[PDB]
Amino acid sequence: MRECISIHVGQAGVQIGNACWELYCLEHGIQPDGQMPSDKTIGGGDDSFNTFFSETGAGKHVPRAVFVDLEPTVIDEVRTGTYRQLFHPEQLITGKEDAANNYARGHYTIGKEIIDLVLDRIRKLADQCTGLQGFLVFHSFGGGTGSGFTSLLMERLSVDYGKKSKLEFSIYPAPQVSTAVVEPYNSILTTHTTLEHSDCAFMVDNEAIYDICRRNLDIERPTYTNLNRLISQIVSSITASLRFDGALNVDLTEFQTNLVPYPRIHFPLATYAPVISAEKAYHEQLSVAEITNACFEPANQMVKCDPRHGKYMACCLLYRGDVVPKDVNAAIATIKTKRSIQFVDWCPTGFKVGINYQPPTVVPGGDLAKVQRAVCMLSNTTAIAEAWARLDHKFDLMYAKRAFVHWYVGEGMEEGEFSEAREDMAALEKDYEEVGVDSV
Amino acid sequence: YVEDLSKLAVTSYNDIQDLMDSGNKARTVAATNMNETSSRSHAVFNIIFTQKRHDAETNITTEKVSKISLVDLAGSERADSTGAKGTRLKEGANINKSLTTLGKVISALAEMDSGPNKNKKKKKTDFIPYRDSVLTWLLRENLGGNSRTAMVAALSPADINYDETLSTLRYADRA
Amino acid sequence: MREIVHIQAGQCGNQIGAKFWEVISDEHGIDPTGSYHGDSDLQLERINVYYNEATGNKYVPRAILVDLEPGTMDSVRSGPFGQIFRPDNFVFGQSGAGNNWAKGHYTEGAELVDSVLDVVRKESESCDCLQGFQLTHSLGGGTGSGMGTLLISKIREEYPDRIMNTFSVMPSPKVSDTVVEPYNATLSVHQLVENTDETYCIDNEALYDICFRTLKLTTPTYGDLNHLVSATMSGVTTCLRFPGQLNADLRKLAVNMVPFPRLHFFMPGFAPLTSRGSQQYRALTVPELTQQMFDSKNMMAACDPRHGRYLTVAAIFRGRMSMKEVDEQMLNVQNKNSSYFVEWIPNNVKTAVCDIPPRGLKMSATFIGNSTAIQELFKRISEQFTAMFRRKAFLHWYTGEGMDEMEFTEAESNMNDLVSEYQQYQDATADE
Numbered sequence A: 001m002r003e004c005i006s007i008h009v010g011q012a013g014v015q016i017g018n019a020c021w022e023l024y025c026l027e028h029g030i031q032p033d034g035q036m037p038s039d040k041t042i043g044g045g046d047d048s049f050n051t052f053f054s055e056t057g058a059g060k061h062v063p064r065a066v067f068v069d070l071e072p073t074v075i076d077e078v079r080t081g082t083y084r085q086l087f088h089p090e091q092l093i094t095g096k097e098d099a100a101n102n103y104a105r106g107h108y109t110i111g112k113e114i115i116d117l118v119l120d121r122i123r124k125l126a127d128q129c130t131g132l133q134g135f136l137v138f139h140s141f142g143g144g145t146g147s148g149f150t151s152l153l154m155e156r157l158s159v160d161y162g163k164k165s166k167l168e169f170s171i172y173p174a175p176q177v178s179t180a181v182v183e184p185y186n187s188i189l190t191t192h193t194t195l196e197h198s199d200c201a202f203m204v205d206n207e208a209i210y211d212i213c214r215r216n217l218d219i220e221r222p223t224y225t226n227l228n229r230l231i232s233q234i235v236s237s238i239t240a241s242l243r244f245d246g247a248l249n250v251d252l253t254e255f256q257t258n259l260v261p262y263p264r265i266h267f268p269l270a271t272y273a274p275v276i277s278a279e280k281a282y283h284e285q286l287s288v289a290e291i292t293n294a295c296f297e298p299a300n301q302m303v304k305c306d307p308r309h310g311k312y313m314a315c316c317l318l319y320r321g322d323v324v325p326k327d328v329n330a331a332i333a334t335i336k337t338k339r340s341i342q343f344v345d346w347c348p349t350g351f352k353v354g355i356n357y358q359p360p361t362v363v364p365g366g367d368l369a370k371v372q373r374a375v376c377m378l379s380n381t382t383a384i385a386e387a388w389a390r391l392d393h394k395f396d397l398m399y400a401k402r403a404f405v406h407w408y409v410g411e412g413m414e415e416g417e418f419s420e421a422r423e424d425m426a427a428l429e430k431d432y433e434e435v436g437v438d439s440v
Numbered sequence B: 001y002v003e004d005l006s007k008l009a010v011t012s013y014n015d016i017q018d019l020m021d022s023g024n025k026a027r028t029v030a031a032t033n034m035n036e037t038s039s040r041s042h043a044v045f046n047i048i049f050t051q052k053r054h055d056a057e058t059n060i061t062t063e064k065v066s067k068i069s070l071v072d073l074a075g076s077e078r079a080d081s082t083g084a085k086g087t088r089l090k091e092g093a094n095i096n097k098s099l100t101t102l103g104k105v106i107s108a109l110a111e112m113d114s115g116p117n118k119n120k121k122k123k124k125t126d127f128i129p130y131r132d133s134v135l136t137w138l139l140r141e142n143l144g145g146n147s148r149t150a151m152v153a154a155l156s157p158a159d160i161n162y163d164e165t166l167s168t169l170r171y172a173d174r175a
Numbered sequence C: 001m002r003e004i005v006h007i008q009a010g011q012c013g014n015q016i017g018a019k020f021w022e023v024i025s026d027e028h029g030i031d032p033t034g035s036y037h038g039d040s041d042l043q044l045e046r047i048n049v050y051y052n053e054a055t056g057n058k059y060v061p062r063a064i065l066v067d068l069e070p071g072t073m074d075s076v077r078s079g080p081f082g083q084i085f086r087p088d089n090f091v092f093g094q095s096g097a098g099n100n101w102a103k104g105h106y107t108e109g110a111e112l113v114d115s116v117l118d119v120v121r122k123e124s125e126s127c128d129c130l131q132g133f134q135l136t137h138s139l140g141g142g143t144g145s146g147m148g149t150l151l152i153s154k155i156r157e158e159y160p161d162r163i164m165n166t167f168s169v170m171p172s173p174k175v176s177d178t179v180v181e182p183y184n185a186t187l188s189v190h191q192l193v194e195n196t197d198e199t200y201c202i203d204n205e206a207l208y209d210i211c212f213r214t215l216k217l218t219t220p221t222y223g224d225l226n227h228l229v230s231a232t233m234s235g236v237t238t239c240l241r242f243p244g245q246l247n248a249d250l251r252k253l254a255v256n257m258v259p260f261p262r263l264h265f266f267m268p269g270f271a272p273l274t275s276r277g278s279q280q281y282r283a284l285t286v287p288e289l290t291q292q293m294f295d296s297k298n299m300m301a302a303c304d305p306r307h308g309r310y311l312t313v314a315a316i317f318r319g320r321m322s323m324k325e326v327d328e329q330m331l332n333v334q335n336k337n338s339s340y341f342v343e344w345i346p347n348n349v350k351t352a353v354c355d356i357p358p359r360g361l362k363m364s365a366t367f368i369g370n371s372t373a374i375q376e377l378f379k380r381i382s383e384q385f386t387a388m389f390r391r392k393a394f395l396h397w398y399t400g401e402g403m404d405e406m407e408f409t410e411a412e413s414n415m416n417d418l419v420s421e422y423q424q425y426q427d428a429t430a431d432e
Ligand SMILES: CC(=O)O[C@H]1C(=O)[C@@]2(C)[C@H]([C@H](OC(=O)c3ccccc3)[C@]3(O)C[C@H](OC(=O)[C@H](O)[C@@H](NC(=O)c4ccccc4)c4ccccc4)C(C)=C1C3(C)C)[C@]1(OC(C)=O)CO[C@@H]1C[C@@H]2O
Pocket: C022, C023, C026, C027, C215, C224, C225, C227, C228, C231, C234, C235, C272, C273, C274, C275, C276, C279, C358, C359, C360, C361, C364
């Protein structure tokens, strides 16, 4: 069997999980109450796949999810919403206040206590699991919970399980807009966690998705629901290979094998090509070549990072729907012909291809148009270093005068940990600068 | 200064030795992974010393008054290696907060005295955060102004404590 | 699930608290007798923040009332929302301070403080997980300043971890109502700068200006001013009680606002305030709320923000809206007014959004700034303080109750150090 455990931490994680599980329930035909009419209608087959859901005796399907948050509000919204009966009652809520945008509160003084309960629930889920593939951890930098508790949980998971893959879908701070004053401190303190213990971390930016929504989707005033739906589409495209049949299927292990040239550079960028409104769905073919070319458009990147300032180290394409390998080969050829896209001279192979037959679904009340073909790209490139540099400068501007430091020091943290994390991040940045130099 | 501090008088060495033993016994001490008898509180030992001269023709009574201040500070801590829980963690956090304030006032003092000395001589204005903690508040006259002050830094030799030893050396250089 | 214990001291604090409890009981559908008559299920979900539950399915606010004049308590009881409070929390004595800070702090309040602390302990021990306290009082008066400072000191001695808010009405620039306002104000600020986490500065003249120029009221009374302050107070703690797309606890505001421990004096504001006459002209959108919040005319502290710089600001919106528009507007406000924000705190605008708006409004917003211009206020008091302390204008009344010149001198020194600390960020061009 092939399955993976989804963990959600913080408000961003919980809301992205709401979107993701809405999409999964729509995909597999599971009603919000957990029942599947197709079981009673057909009496056979496999529709409620084991990759995400577990079937109990009475035909109810319960997701393999673990929600975590220090606030009671965000998860209490879920526990009295449309999906109140879907989830197991074990939701792991800390009956106290929140980390208050403090890494120390989410890592040292309050991030404990409930960590043991969280690990117990993960162990109970794993014991029911056969052939576990890995973990999908959803969180966000800039929040006390999403950083500190993510650090605690990832450390404990690496200690306990170790060899199992641990993917990450995190929201990096945007270059210009943010909703916190102490965001850079948290983002710079989370780098040791994101570097040492994670196996492959996908980063997204709110500003980039806002621009995508404004331009491609023609939504003038988007909110977080659209962002969560887009991220859910990306995650579904990533994990579709474990569930549906396909010509060229790519599981998580062989996916990782062709995207991590070295252990310390596991920071790919993620894009989704056919983001288009219903009105513009007409007047356009949306062939394989069009979507493959659109994957490379700098405007369509979901992190504010221009690929043309760096070199592409590796690329993985995941196609869904009526796609044939001949057109994919043609698209790869014409892309390799182009000179604007620069590839490192030590990776002549370049591209990994995966194809799946199941086309993407349409969420009711959504914005994406129904399409026959889609492609999700993941790309390891050096240009992401620039996205880090703009952050580091900000941190210096706040650490020179020791602003807001006493809040962190008064909850267990030492002053030196800031400098240690900054040095580690500088080492990572210089590693990315080194890997892209042409060989001689 | 401190109000209602039990300032006593001693005439021989035995009395002050008894006071020293009583004070050391009264200090709050707890065991930790980095030290079996770590200090949980800053400590200040104050000697008020008065010299008087008696002669109606030439001398002055109460001619000299001076203060000897001897300060034992609690060091920085890291919760990972310290292994503190509950009250120990709170004590460590408070100690680190006070030491951060002390480092900030040291650095600000250093920059302020160096600039007006070297730059021109402007002396426009330079706020110094003495009031951010009680430790720096009580030692205002010792860190600057009316005192002659010495700083004794202790250093651990091992490689594992390199990051803390370098910080201690840097702050000694600043001092 | 979090609680807030509420304390009220003095005439001004008592009246503001009464209006605040009327605004909160409306938002939650509690009737002037304790019975629930609401319509939305979300009202009762987080009612534990302010109200305890009684045996008869009634709700009793977690409030504590303090004074040394029974007249204020009698006025509160004989009112529309007098019976809602429990009688055991009415703590008072006789022979009020008479605008004497020493009587409030040292002579008379020292006897009633034990009873007030007993009631505070009784209310605090019943909470599932206490968050913090909040106190309403006037700095320029008698029992208000003294008992508020004494209670703050005692509670911080007993509850060091918890949050301590304070909504203080400071002396006005030119409007005055007692002769000895500077002495009480200076001593109270000397007490507050040490023993508080947040302090929302409120000025009577700013509220009068808001009533006259913005709301176009011809004969404003104290009720209107209490209304505004009460709308601000509800707006501060909205995220504890209702769901939102991006919540903001009290600790989040405390962390994101104050850069250093001694700078926790906040200028508040609220929007949308129209005129009952031009409601049909102004469209309600996020840009309009952003325009009104940052307007210098709309602040409640009577200190012009354009004379300083914003160390930090926090905007808490309530109502259905788009996060893209909110973030774009905050970035726009930063970028255009580039000279009024410090250069060493990049992106110094905290944002919070709550789903449920007030009763009959489609959208609302509250603003919490932390600007160096607040220094002006302190300077004014300090100036007046000198003008009386140099000649010992009224000092015998204060020294007769057990004080001395050293207390006054050290309070003045603390005020001046605070003013210097705010000044040292006020200028641009940190180099020379
Ligand atoms: C057209 C319409 O519906 O009437 C409005 C109205 O005209 C305006 C002018 C109202 C009106 O307010 C005033 O006129 C006023 C005068 C002096 C001091 C304070 C307010 C209103 O009274 C105020 C009242 O607001 C509320 O009811 C809010 O829920 C408010 N609570 C109370 O006012 C309240 C008072 C006593 C008892 C119970 C509730 C609130 C706001 C924020 C947070 C919590 C509560 C509203 C919508 C209006 C009237 C009735 C005219 C305004 O007030 C607020 C805060 O809504 C003044 O500026 C706003 C904008 C509104 O458009």
